[PDB]
Structure 1
Amino acid sequence: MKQAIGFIDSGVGGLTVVREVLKQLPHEQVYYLGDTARCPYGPRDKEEVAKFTWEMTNFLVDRGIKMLVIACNTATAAALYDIREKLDIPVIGVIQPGSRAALKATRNNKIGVLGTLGTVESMAYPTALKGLNRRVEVDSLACPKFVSVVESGEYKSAIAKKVVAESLLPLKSTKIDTVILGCTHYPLLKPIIENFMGDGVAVINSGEETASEVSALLDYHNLLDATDEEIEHRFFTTGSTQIFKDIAKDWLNMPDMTVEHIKLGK
């Protein structure tokens, strides 16, 4: 009768959300699916992204999940409303939780948003933020290089420092006191970004609030488990299981995990 929390993503970035779920909800089993054969999603057409997101959704629903996290900013924007309406389990994305966390952390209502070209172009974060607080001013900044620096493992190195300083220089001209990491890969750069931005700026890992919302929703529906003793996490990918496993076992401190290859769509 034990059921997983499902996570869907285009790749490995959603693992940063899983990381916070492991901390905050240690009794819950996680089923994660990264569609690495077809990432990036950012460049793709909304219809296509919804179709892909439904394929991933349907796969995890067949596997038995009691809640779904769309742990991808692009998929969250393209499909959240339709999936939430059609499924009878709770479904959330990462954008409303990140926005909430920013509104909690800000003191001057000047917020920065870092993300992919697609994310920043969507205006999803400004729309969420401003709907909650009309006084907020939001500066959005595309950071095209960051995903590569993280996936390639360079995110602690001298390269990351230079890439962060280069990319975020515009933000230094502002009085922003809060920066939302609006791409699930970006938490791996968080210490470097905090260093560049300085001690007056709160840097938001939206996985932390997302995990809290999962916990709250599970409680709200009386679905929280009491033990981790028969926990069997499962990781699924459409791309290379080895490349995925190599990253995941490091980010999640899980040397013994198993990654299942799957075939979706076409």
Structure 2
Amino acid sequence: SNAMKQAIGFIDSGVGGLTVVREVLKQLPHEQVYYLGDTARCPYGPRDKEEVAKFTWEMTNFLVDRGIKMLVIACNTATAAALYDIREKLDIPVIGVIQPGSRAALKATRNNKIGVLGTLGTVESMAYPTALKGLNRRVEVDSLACPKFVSVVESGEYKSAIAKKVVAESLLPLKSTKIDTVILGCTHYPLLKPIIENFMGDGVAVINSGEETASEVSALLDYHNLLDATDEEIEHRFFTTGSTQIFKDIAKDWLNMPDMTVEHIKLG
């Protein structure tokens, strides 16, 4: 039976949340994942906060109805828009990805000059400089909106020549700075990390916040006595509001999970 195992829920606009899933699979191999990507409504990047929060709640309600024991808002715009409201209203633990990436960045920097890549809405929220300066008021933080990146990732062309061109064109400004650490402030961006790293070179630490987010999941599950303790067969479930085949093609590449269950759903 699967009745004892309760899933950790993850919500995101598309495939980006899988960068957190990957580190959860590694750090918490006994935990079941329920994932929902709102592919039909991706991009969230250029949407208004009120709308993002509304959509984020739709995703949350879908997974809460399926019995999850914890929720990860594996999406930067969604975190900025709705984390506190959702944390406050739910009874289960709820985290986002902005604070973990902030902590990781501060740990990686040598000169306290941090760059942030994200969407239009993430950049406009100022969530990263606010979080970063909240931990260390002396850090310098400069952010760059990369509206093309999610399109390249969602179209599955994140290893292609086009990806290489879009990265080089979007990131050239960073080379005018002394920034030594760059936060991937959209959860889609680690799919491009090899290209970003090759472009920026060995002097810049490129931060995928998935590892730090997954450690926070582990820490909170242990703290609240919520770690799974059963031998029941793990049955992960992926849900998308778009096409299942394209989701599977990307997810199977990123996670190495050949026998994945991916279903289409309708929200809103």
How far the C-alpha of 1:168 sits from its partner, in A, is 1.1
Range that drifts further, 205-214 or 163-172: 163-172
- Superposed structure 1 runs of 4+ greater than 3 Å apart: 226-229
| Contact 2:5/2:230 (8 A) holds in 1 | no
CA distance in 2, matches of 1:9, 1:192: 23
TM-score (norm 2): 0.95
| 2:48 aligned with 1:49 | no
Q: Is the CA contact 2:20–2:211 (under 8 Å) kept in the aligned structure 1?
A: yes
Matched-pair identity in %: 100
Deviations 1:235-260 (A, max 9, x none): 11122122212221222111111112
Is 2:45–2:147's contact at 8 Å kept on the other side of the alignment?
Answer: no
- 2:199 maps to what in 1? 196
Change (3 A) 1:208 1:228: farther
Cα offsets for 1:207-249 (capped at 9, x unmatched): 1110111011111111112456510001111221222122212
| SS of 2:40 mapped into structure 1 | coil
Query: Could you give the per-residue CA deviations for residues 170-198 of structure 1, whole angstroms, max 9, x where no partner exists?
Result: 11111111000001111011111112212
Q: Which runs of 5+ in 2 are unaligned?
A: none
The 2-side partners of 1:156 and 1:230 are apart by 34
TM-score, normalised to structure 1, is: 0.95
- CA distance in 2 between counterparts of 1:228 and 1:155 reads 37
Change in 2 beyond 3 A, CA 1:228/1:149: farther
> Any unmatched runs of 5+ in structure 1?
none
Distance 1:261 1:179 in 2: 34
The answer to whether the Cα contact below 8 Å between 2:20 and 2:214 also exists between their aligned partners in 1 is yes
2:43/2:150 contact within 8 Å kept: no
My pick for the range that moved more, 93-102 or 53-62, is: 53-62
Is the contact between residue 28 and residue 228 of structure 1 (CA under 8 Å) also seen in structure 2?
Answer: no
Count residues in correspondence. Answer: 265
Which segment is superposed worse, 205-214 or 227-236?
227-236
RMSD across aligned positions (CA): 1.3
Q: CA deviation at 1:67?
A: 0.5
CA distance in 2, matches of 1:205, 1:168: 16
Once the two structures are overlaid, the 10-residue window that deviates more, 153-162 or 44-53, is 153-162
CA contact (8 A) 1:26 1:228 kept: no
Classify the secondary structure of the residue corresponding to 1:69.
strand
- One of 126, 141, 145 as aligned partner of 1:142: 145
Displacement of 1:78 in angstroms is 0.8
